[PDB]
RNA sequence: ACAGGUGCUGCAUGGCUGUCGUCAGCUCGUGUCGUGAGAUGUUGGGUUAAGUCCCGCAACGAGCGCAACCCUUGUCCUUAGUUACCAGGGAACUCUAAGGAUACUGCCAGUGACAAACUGGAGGAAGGCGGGGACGACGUCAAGUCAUCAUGGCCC
């Protein structure tokens, strides 16, 4: 029923997440193997809190660039666990791709990372309701001008499930020019599957 | 200045109350009598009263106290402005929004944007913005500026409340009323005495009469204040 | 050598004005030939029969896109505009007859879930 | 007038051709201006989280000139689900002959 | 060990979607009233496409919706001139495609509570939401989807 947020976006406050160039006959083998190299990282980045990745690429190489807020357990000590995922990188992937690690100043102004947190705790059982105020406080105390988090799915186990939300500030959807960070993720339960999703409004 | 005449009370004609049928059995000891259906009020009463009330209000504006003017009547609007702002108290003139002191934790937010918005228009913000836009933030302004233009240095809740026409003015007596904050007030024949503490039986309905209730209060606390200023040095 | 740009639909027409005869040129070939719908006839001659000239000039017309009577209003549009450039005051008299305001219709897009830009496919009750 | 009667997720059996045909033929005789009747008759869910109670379903849309009127019927038992849609339906029919014959007055 | 399952359950679910409905609504904080469920705000006078706006008003404010920011089209300008154009090799014009200008009830005459607004007129390519699209509130229908995918349980 919404659209969404990013997608909307894209073009008039946004940017995407990747930007190479490809002949259409080149288009689908770029594509293929950026959601390829996408899903292996984001599997394997796991316990790292990463954020959006930009894949962008030139002509062979390519430049990927993951936002993280834990760049220690990311690179390693002294480089020594970006090259060994380097290596796996460009053993899948074409030519030799160069990795750069950012760092998110506010880990409680990206959507992601807090629905991640938000997913760890709720499949670490903790009160599904805590979590959300909990998100919902760290980010609106954190210089958020609106936070806005949903839970839908057997909720503590129930039998019938329900949608809970939290808003606190203003995220207005329907403006474009809204710079809305959004991030939408599951909680693994022992009753199923917890949609958490997460709208963060910051400004203009 | 603390103490009223009875003779230019009667000129303003401030004993003149409603028709015999509007009253207010409560007013009972301080109506005179009834000339051709219409009460009239004791000037003994009012005058002794008045006295009372204007020893408060020195007492008050002695210790630096805010006494808030409150009258929305048609004949009371201009001359509360004016000899609030005269004495330097706060006043209301247009219309008590509800909740004015009960609910002052959120008219704060009001006070404060009308604050603000007067910086905005008084360090020239209007090279900035558009045509319209800053034509419509103006607009706000002063609409803001009606409603809660006298009460913006108020800085918290006032010390007493001078209302004028009690009947009038019942959200504000109830809100006295249930903060606690003394109320002194002109309070007419046809008018509810309860909940006032300092009550002046007058007539609150010609604007010649009402001048002089506002101007007498206005001249009391000045002589307070400046009584208060006496033992700077 | 009073030169205007005429639009319409989808034609774009180029009309050069001189003072002349009234041989009017439509992309190389003379209006009467060019225009076999003698509606299509009428729009071009419009601007110049509005205000009694219309064996006064000489017109050097170049349509390029659009159909057969949108080419002709794009003709009459490029026109008024020439005439417009040629003099200022003819702009009040051949303003009261909409020559001058471009056409701004266009083809309205076709629509997802329907047949049209308008048409709804029929269900029957 | 049409009576068509289709089953969605069930296979609609002679006795449910039957239980719903009576009833139709029932309902035109009192009101001969119904242009059509279309009958579904379904199985919508399993009953996982309540046992049923509504496993079955009977919906019954009627045309009538210049007016549609459509009933459901939710229970457990499909019979049961017939009977009340076909209650339901003839309670409206009634409703729309009365205002009709009503609105000449 | 297991893998595999387009096997079952959409009435255990996530994600996605339809629908009322691009309808103008849906709420909350504080205050006040009521024993209470609740109410008020959100009602009323107008006005609008619009809970749009103004004015009143025990309410004062806020949020999601409305509107705007986005795309395209309609006029003009700037950079550029090939594979585009052709007025006289040209750098005019058409065109292509990036950045802008314009439009705001801005002006006039009225009606209107000294209001919001409405009616008409000028100029302009466009006039009052210029035309079209994207955008689909809280919820509803145990609506659809376990056969895109993921997924608790059951089953081979």
Redesign the pocket.
């Known amino acids: 029923?919404?659209?969404?947020p990013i997608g909307?976006r894209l073009?008039?406050v946004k940017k995407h997440n990747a930007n190479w160039y490809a002949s259409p006959k080149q288009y689908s083998e770029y594509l293929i193997n950026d959601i390829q190299v996408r899903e292996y990282l984001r599997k394997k980045l796991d316990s790292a809190m990463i954020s959006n990745i930009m894949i962008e690429r030139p002509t062979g190489a390519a430049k990927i660039t993951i936002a993280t807020a834990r760049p220690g357990i990311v690179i390693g000590k002294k480089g020594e666990d970006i090259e060994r995922l380097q290596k796996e990188l460009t053993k899948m992937m074409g030519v030799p791709a160069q990795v750069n690690i950012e760092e998110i100043t506010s880990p409680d102004l990206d959507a992601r990372l807090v629905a991640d947190g938000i997913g760890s705790q709720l499949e670490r059982r903790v009160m599904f309701r805590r979590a959300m105020k909990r998100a919902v406080q760290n980010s609106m105390r954190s210089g958020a001008k609106?936070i806005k988090v949903?839970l839908?799915?057997?909720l503590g186990g129930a039998?019938?499930?329900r949608?809970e939300?939290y808003?606190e500030g203003?995220?207005?959807?329907?403006?474009?020019?809204?710079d809305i960070d959004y991030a939408?993720v599951?909680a693994?339960t022992?009753?199923?599957?917890?949609?958490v999703?997460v709208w963060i409004f910051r400004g203009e | 200045p603390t103490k009223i005449e009875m003779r230019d009370l009667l000129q303003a004609g401030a004993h003149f109350g409603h028709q015999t049928r509007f009253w207010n059995p409560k007013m009972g000891p301080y109506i005179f009598g009834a000339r051709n259906k219409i009460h009239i009020i004791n000037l003994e009463h009012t005058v002794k009263a008045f006295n009372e009330a204007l020893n408060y209000v020195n007492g008050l504006a002695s210790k630096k106290n805010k006494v808030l003017f409150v009258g929305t009547k048609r004949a009371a609007s201009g001359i509360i402005a004016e000899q609030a702002t005269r004495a330097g108290m706060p006043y209301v003139d247009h219309?008590?929004?509800?909740?004015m002191l009960?609910?002052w934790?959120?008219?704060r937010?009001?006070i404060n944007r009308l604050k603000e918005l007067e910086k905005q228009a008084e360090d020239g913000t209007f090279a900035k913005l558009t045509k319209?836009e800053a034509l419509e933030r103006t607009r706000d302004m002063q609409?803001?500026e009606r409603?809660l233009g006298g009460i913006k240095d108020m800085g918290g809740l006032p010390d007493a409340i001078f209302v004028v026409d009690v009947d009038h003015e019942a959200?504000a007596i109830?809100?006295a009323k249930?903060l606690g904050i003394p109320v002194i007030g002109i309070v007419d024949t046809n008018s509810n005495p309860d909940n006032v503490d300092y009550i002046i039986p007058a007539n609150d309905d010609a604007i010649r009469a009402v001048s002089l209730y506002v101007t007498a209060m206005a001249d009391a606390i000045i002589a307070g204040k400046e009584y208060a200023q006496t033992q700077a040095s | 050598?009073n030169?205007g740009?005429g639009?319409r639909k989808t034609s774009?027409a180029?009309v050069?004005l001189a003072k002349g005869t009234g041989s009017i040129v439509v992309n190389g070939k003379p209006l009467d030939e060019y225009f076999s719908r003698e509606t299509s006839r009428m729009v071009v001659r419009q601007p110049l029969e509005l205000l009694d000239s219309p064996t006064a000039y000489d017109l050097?017309i170049?349509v390029?896109g659009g159909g057969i009577s949108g080419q002709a209003g794009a003709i009459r549009h490029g026109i008024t505009r020439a005439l417009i450039e040629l003099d200022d005051t003819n702009?009040?008299a051949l303003?009261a007859a909409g020559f001058?305001?471009?056409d701004?219709r266009?083809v309205?897009?076709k629509?997802?879930g329907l047949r049209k830009a308008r048409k709804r496919p029929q269900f029957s009750k | 007038m049409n009576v068509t009667i289709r089953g969605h997720h069930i296979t609609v059996t002679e006795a449910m051709n039957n239980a719903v045909h009576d009833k139709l033929t029932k309902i035109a005789r009192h009101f001969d201006q119904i242009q059509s009747i279309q009958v579904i008759l379904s199985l919508?869910?399993?009953?996982?989280?309540?046992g049923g109670?509504?496993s079955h379903k009977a919906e019954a849309i009627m045309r009538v000139s210049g007016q549609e009127m459509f009933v459901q019927a939710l229970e457990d038992d499909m019979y049961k689900a017939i009977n009340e849609m076909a209650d339901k339906l003839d309670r409206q029919v009634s409703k729309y002959k009365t205002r009709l014959e009503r609105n000449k007055v």
Request: proline share 2%; hydrophobic share 25%.
């Open positions: 029923q919404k659209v969404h909307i073009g008039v609106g949903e839908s799915g057997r039998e019938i499930a949608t939300w808003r203003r995220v207005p959807l329907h403006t474009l020019r809204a939408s599951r693994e022992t009753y199923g599957t917890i949609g999703k | 219309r008590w929004l509800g909740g009960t609910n934790k959120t008219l937010q009001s319209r609409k803001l409603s959200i109830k809100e249930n | 050598r030169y740009t639009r774009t180029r050069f050097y170049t390029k702009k009040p303003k001058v305001t471009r701004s266009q309205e897009r629509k997802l | 919508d869910n399993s009953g996982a989280s309540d109670q509504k």
